[PDB]
Amino acid sequence: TQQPIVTGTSVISMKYDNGVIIAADNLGSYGSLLRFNGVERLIPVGDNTVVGISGDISDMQHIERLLKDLVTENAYDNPLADAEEALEPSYIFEYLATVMYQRRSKMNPLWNAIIVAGVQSNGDQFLRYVNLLGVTYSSPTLATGFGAHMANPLLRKVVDRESDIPKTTVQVAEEAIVNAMRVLYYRDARSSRNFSLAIIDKNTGLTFKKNLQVENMKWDFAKDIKGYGTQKI
Amino acid sequence: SDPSSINGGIVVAMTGKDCVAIACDLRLGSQSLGVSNKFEKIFHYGHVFLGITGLATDVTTLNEMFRYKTNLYKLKEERAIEPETFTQLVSSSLYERRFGPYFVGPVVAGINSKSGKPFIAGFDLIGCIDEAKDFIVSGTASDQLFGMCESLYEPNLEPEDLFETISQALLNAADRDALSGWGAVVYIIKKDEVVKRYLKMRQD
Amino acid sequence: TTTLAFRFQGGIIVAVDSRATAGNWVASQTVKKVIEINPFLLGTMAGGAADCQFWETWLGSQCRLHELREKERISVAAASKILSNLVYQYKGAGLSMGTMICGYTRKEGPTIYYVDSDGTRLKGDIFCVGSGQTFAYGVLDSNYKWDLSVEDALYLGKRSILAAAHRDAYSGGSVNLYHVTEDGWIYHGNHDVGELFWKVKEEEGSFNNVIG
Amino acid sequence: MDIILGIRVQDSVILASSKAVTRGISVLKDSDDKTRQLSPHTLMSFAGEAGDTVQFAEYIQANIQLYSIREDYELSPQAVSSFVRQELAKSIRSRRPYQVNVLIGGYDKKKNKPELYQIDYLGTKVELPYGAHGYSGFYTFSLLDHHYRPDMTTEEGLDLLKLCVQELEKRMPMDFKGVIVKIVDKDGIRQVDDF
Amino acid sequence: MDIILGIRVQDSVILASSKAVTRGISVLKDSDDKTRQLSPHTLMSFAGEAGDTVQFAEYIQANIQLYSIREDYELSPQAVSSFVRQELAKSIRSRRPYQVNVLIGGYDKKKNKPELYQIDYLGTKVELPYGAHGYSGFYTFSLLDHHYRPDMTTEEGLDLLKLCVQELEKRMPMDFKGVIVKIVDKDGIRQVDDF
Amino acid sequence: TSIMAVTFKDGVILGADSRTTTGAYIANRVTDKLTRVHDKIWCCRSGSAADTQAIADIVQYHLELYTSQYGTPSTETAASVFKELCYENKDNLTAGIIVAGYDDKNKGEVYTIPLGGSVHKLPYAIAGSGSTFIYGYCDKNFRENMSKEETVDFIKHSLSQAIKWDGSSGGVIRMVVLTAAGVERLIFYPDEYEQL
Amino acid sequence: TSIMAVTFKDGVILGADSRTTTGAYIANRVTDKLTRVHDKIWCCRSGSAADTQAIADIVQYHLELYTSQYGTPSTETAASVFKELCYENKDNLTAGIIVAGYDDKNKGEVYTIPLGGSVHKLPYAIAGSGSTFIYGYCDKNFRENMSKEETVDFIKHSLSQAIKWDGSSGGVIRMVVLTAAGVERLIFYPDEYEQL
Amino acid sequence: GYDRALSIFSPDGHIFQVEYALEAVKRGTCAVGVKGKNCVVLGCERRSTLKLQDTRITPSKVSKIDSHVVLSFSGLNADSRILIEKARVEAQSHRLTLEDPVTVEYLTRYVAGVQQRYTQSGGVR
Amino acid sequence: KATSTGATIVGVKFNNGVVIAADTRSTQGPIVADKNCAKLHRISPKIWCAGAGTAADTEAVTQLIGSNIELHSLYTSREPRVVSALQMLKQHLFKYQGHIGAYLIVAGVDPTGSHLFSIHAHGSTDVGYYLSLGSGSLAAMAVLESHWKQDLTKEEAIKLASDAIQAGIWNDLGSGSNVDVCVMEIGKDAEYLRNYLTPNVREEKQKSYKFPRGTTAVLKESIVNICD
Amino acid sequence: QFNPYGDNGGTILGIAGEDFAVLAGDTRNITDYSINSRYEPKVFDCGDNIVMSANGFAADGDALVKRFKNSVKWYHFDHNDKKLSINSAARNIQHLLYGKRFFPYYVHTIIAGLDEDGKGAVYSFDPVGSYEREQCRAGGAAASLIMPFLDNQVNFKNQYEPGTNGKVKKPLKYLSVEEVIKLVRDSFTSATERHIQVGDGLEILIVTKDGVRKEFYELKRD
Ligand SMILES: [Mg+2]
Ligand SMILES: [Mg+2]
Ligand SMILES: [Mg+2]
Ligand SMILES: [Mg+2]
């Protein structure tokens, strides 16, 4: 203990036929105060992995440094650091999962909920979750915080089980992710309009999109809504 | 401390083909101490049967209350109360004590004398009606009863087959509960005959 | 839980029930509450199941080391004190243990030590521990004699657990009987309480309150 | 108050109640009679919180005596026990409940049967061949379960009761200063002055 | 543990200690000896938390026996009581303190005087003509204040002790199952086997 | 919640966001926080939604009965009725209400009734969780006797900032204009005010 | 406390009020909250006075030892040392620090380190209890590459409003200007800024 | 701490520090033990090079380890006190934990174990 | 220990009226008490009420107001209005300061038109074109926010409503089993569509557990007298 | 305040046959009222013909299984590739669990396999390491729903032979692997109906002398 302070909200993600997509907004909240508006919560590791982090931002920055140090360390005395002995999404996740569970076991957790998204050496999609308790799980769609309640239902309508993954294109997957981010902006009071989105594809590699915005919003219907029951004017 | 598990006990009710069954254990205890092995939890008012689990003082009080009310009902209406009507009376009566409730889990069972339709219903301590087609469970081994009934039950069982199903549901549920057992009773109810059977079970 | 042990002319009788509960939920009816420390020593399980199992198996290891080093059977006094000194080190940490360490040696004769997780170590003739201990004490106290036969002593231990199994909601399942002699303990079977209750009711005429 | 025991035999009900009254540190009395005669053939013993025990018992006694005079008739033990249960069931949801547990030993002159009723402060009534309140049952019920017979004589009941009291005196930490024993039968209520 | 009493008379110290061991609901034993011989002419009785009482007593016993062997000499009762006090004073600021109260009855062979020391678990030592721990003093000290004389014989001390135990048995709520009485004098330690 | 009322040359305008939260969940993103207690007496509500609705409904009843007997009530009278309910029941209420109205004799008037149930007549008032972030901005930018268009801009800019920083505020900016000409409702959407 | 740091064309300026309170009592009305950790690296302190002084003293030591070995530290390096102390000891510290410095290579830089011990590089930063009231004002009025005089006016106006509304802020407005030309201290008294 | 290996093997397989310790024993006054059918007698030599000695208080050659076991020695007097103290502590420790006094063999095995330990521990002779 | 069920309840406005829908799971803690309860209730013929929270409080409050609405309708010789039910519900709930844990979606038609409200236990009310309540409200609202539009037809609104309920059924553990729907169109009778969808049918068991007759041990048999 | 524990739901079931053993578990992983995964394997092949599941708090469950698998590896290194018998594995798991007696693995562990006579074996553990060989054991969320059914249908409890009326018990005849799997499937189908945390999928690991085989079945997803 004691408490998360400056925090990031939902991280959402899903698998598709040739890879994975992950997204997270650019807000750092300070309670109900929307304090920091340019926080990047997707952190790429190499060209095959993107780690999405929610929760305490100070701990996120600590994890960000651990990953940076992991890349440095892997390159030491390693002629194949950019080839066969490069960091895999599975290596990066297992390392973080170890750290998270160790920290909770000392009663001094990193406060975060983490999603590691990537593509393995053999082209396999990697998508797994880990949090402050060291709890880990995998699913065709994964989301943290509010995303778990609102994004997953929408993303699961696209990929409801393992056999739906090969039938899902990157265009359909990205469309679903972007819509979910809009829904979260409507309904999560600790969300922002600005977000980042990353695609890790086994053919086209890592595509990192910054400064995206929620668009095509429906608000017009608000003009007709008056009072809270009996009021007509 | 928890009023609904001081005395212990269970009730289960099931529907069959042109019949209903309601059953209960016979234990009354003071927490770990067994006090009585003859504490029956099923009562009847005419052809309508009521099982009540929970705090034993309230079980007794509610039985006396519903005897009181169904007796006045009969004098005024000039007919015996039906299971559907009685269910509403139980619900009403429990909800009138919304902020000082009886700590009970009542179960109604019976056959409508005019339509011949089998009827069962359950309640929480505050009057919320559970009107299941298949079965109703109540008491300190309700989880165990849900497990037994869900696997053992099938619809349209004949009276003598329903007896075996409900008996085995009760017995094996009660044997996995410290505060239930010490004997058991099963009522098999048909439109104009009711049979009551006391079961043999382990006495620990 | 109901566990008892008593000294008599023919050694020690150890009798236990078999029920383990988690709240009102009966977790098991087949729990082994007598721990066979070694062929000569027995311990009873009450309080924490793990604490009793673990530390009384550990005790068996310490007893084995003792007799390897000293070339002599460990006394019940020494064996019980190894356990009580151990749990006393852990006092305050939250160990839960109420056990009877039972043995029969040359120098001591039949000996029982009540050992307990707050550090208590009591030598005695009759001990009864568990949620149903008061019921078993009643049958024990009114029927106990030093000059009981092995057969009658075994039945008394069996009947006393049955008394507890009947009345105590958290005792039952089956009865396990042991007879501890100088040459080692002898197991006297598992007895289902359900079957035993009716058998005893008929043969003894007891439990007239219950319809059979 | 502490130990109160009851046993219904062939032709009578026997109530045994401890004599000690302890106010914290000291035993203030060792001859206290924890019972009230409700009617000629009905006796009630009681135990619970100080003050409330006697206040409740005397309140019940006054009510049954009033009924007896109004109707020129003695209520059955069953009827008296039902009246008592209702009062305790009423009391448990009061502003300040009576913290009183009772045993009602009566001889029904109509049915020619002894009857023992056990009622706790919640209004939990049970008719029993033998009963107790508090920890008394924990020590005594295993003995009663073993030896009890429905056709026992009054003398055999007293002997089984002595065995129960002996077990209490052996294994109970508290000194309850012995018991006062009373017998309820067809001839009414009498006290066993040597026990 | 419950009652422990001590009285220093003309030529001896007498320690009386209850025999009951109660672990909550049941009295597990009624013949427990709550004392240890530290040296031939020094006896220590004890009462407090379960386990810690015996563990402390035996630990002290081992230390005094070690001193006796090393020096081939018996420490004075005063010296033993000071050693015991320091151990308890050390213990009270430990991680987990010994919750043990003791009486030390010794006969000083150099001065030819009996000596009684009362020490509580805090390390509070006092030399007294008579002493107790717990509630024992509340019932017995008024009797001792009245009857005690420094020139009493051992037999008179035992009679005054009997009066104290009788008052305890009358007014104490708990059944402590009588007392074991031991006498410490110039000839050493002996137990009064009929009390 | 971010609410305000501003007097200007031709009368008064009430402004509000439309976000209602249960913790971090937005239960209603299109709430109408501008409530009518009389024809030209409106109020902005903050605090417990149940409490402020209950109070407003009672006030509307009181002013309807007042009107039947004594004719149109003053804005001061409406504020007094609000205060009476808020003050006397302060122990059981969490309500922060801004009362705004237009008379022909008195013109535009604003009264704020904070938690304690006190009354304060002001040229303009701000309230709700989002108001904290615009005390500086509003104090620097408010002028007396502004035009309708200036006052709309002032409220739009103020509530834009309150919404930007306060997570409990958001959605659309609703406004109600009270003048001799009548009652006009205005609404402004995120795409409009976020780029200010 | 009301503190801020603003980058501008020629470098950076730190601003602060001078009020230190113990409850409602003003223990010091002329506090200096602008502290020097290196020649042209300063910081503004908020939170526990004991904690922020202890941290600042340690940082000043670290940068003095850094300078002896490796030459002048960057503002980023200073912010990193602050963050290391604030993050690693987050359980035992209540410290909100704004770090401002001038390099010749990097020019004016501002880093804010809030309660949790995270770092945020910003064009300008505001902190302290009084900052809440000027989020709206500062966001509307800040421009990049302002002149020295404009930045002094921006800070003076901002902290004036923070002081006006926050009871925990007050006294004089202190400022420290960091440029290539050197280090300049400024002070502004109540009679000056209250009439703004 | 001082960790120097003083007791070590020589090329011929001897540990000279242990063998030189035996030479210190050879110098010590003679001690003798004889066990009868129902007794054991320990005899000890006192060198008469030291008169004007106070025999009341001078350390006696035979020492009680417990009430039932005794220890005599030959060699360095100061060294013997350390073994005697350890033995006495262990005797009481044994009574405390086993609830039985030490056997003579056990006490011997303990003292012999202490001596052995000092032949392959660093920094000790 | 009163029933508080998991639920997904929704309300959607369309062209010529309003539709409400709900799942059919009633929970006791983690245990499914009723696998096919009816959460759609009547207040009046053309005003219906979906309820969540404390089950006893939702039913009780809906019946009480429904009773008073019927008497009010008879007294005024007029068909009952949704705003009357809304006002009576909220003033009742507010008086008890949230101790009556009733959370409702109210929906219906009346001479004034079609209406859709939500009521919260403490006595606050909201207006909307689409609303959701229950433990699966977030799952349902995600669907409503994704697919809702202005000028929905009858068939589109039923599809949207049931899709929102399905999101709750699959993704929320508190909700499950079937989908109930009630459609209230202007100028027509309200049509209650009990078990409109049944996508969670129990599969055939691998084995029959019909016991041989005589399996259960019996101590005593006796004929019970139900007659006078 | 930081709570180091959580509840991931799930239900597991171990049944020992005459010359086989099954360890089954649902594949659903949850927190509160949300589904984390519809397929997250919970029963693991640990080598040496031993299958294991640690149900409850999944982080502790994964840690324990991982440490046991590691213990099997080091047992081979230290003891000349000797096969770890099911009884030895059970005792080893006790020590792993009791090692954290004062900060326990919040799980209910069950292992299954064959004993050294080739007979089916199941061992059941509490969170702090107390264990027992058992014939039949359900663990986790729906254990209270499943065990009574197993008492009745595996051990024939309260069942007597028709005509005798309680005098002769129904004889305890041995069940085949096909018969056990039927009872496992019906246990989980029933548990899925009445318990909200049970569903999605059922994975069964069957152990015989030939090795470890897997079977998967769909469960309702509501
Ligand atoms: Mg049972
Ligand atoms: Mg039992
Ligand atoms: Mg906002
Ligand atoms: Mg399910």
Numbering used by the authors:
A (entry chain a): 1 to 233
B (entry chain I): 1 to 204
C (entry chain Y): 1 to 212
D (entry chain J), E (entry chain X): 1 to 195
F (entry chain N), G (entry chain b): 1 to 196
H (entry chain Q): 1 to 125
I (entry chain H): -5 to 222
J (entry chain Z): 1 to 222
Article sentences:
The 20S proteasome core particle (CP) is the key non-lysosomal protease of eukaryotic cells. Its seven different α and seven different β subunits assemble into four heptameric rings that are stacked on each other to form a hollow cylinder. Only three out of the seven different β subunits, namely β1, β2 and β5, bear N-terminal proteolytic active centres, and before CP maturation these are protected by propeptides. In the last stage of CP biogenesis, the prosegments are autocatalytically removed through nucleophilic attack by the active site residue Thr1 on the preceding peptide bond involving Gly(-1)45.
Yeast strains carrying the single mutations β1-T1A or β2-T1A, or both, are viable, even though one or two of the three distinct catalytic β subunits are disabled and carry remnants of their N-terminal propeptides. These results indicate that the β1 and β2 proteolytic activities are not essential for cell survival. Regarding the β2 propeptide, Thr(-2) occupies the S1 pocket but is less deeply anchored compared with Leu(-2) in β1, which might be due to the rather large β2-S1 pocket created by Gly45. Thr(-2) positions Gly(-1)O via hydrogen bonding (∼2.8 Å) in a perfect trajectory for the nucleophilic attack by Thr1Oγ. As proven by the β2-T1A crystal structures, Thr(-2) hydrogen bonds to Gly(-1)O. Although this interaction was not observed for the β5-H(-2)T-T1A mutant, exchange of Thr(-2) by Val in β2, a conservative mutation regarding size but drastic with respect to polarity, was found to inhibit maturation of this subunit.
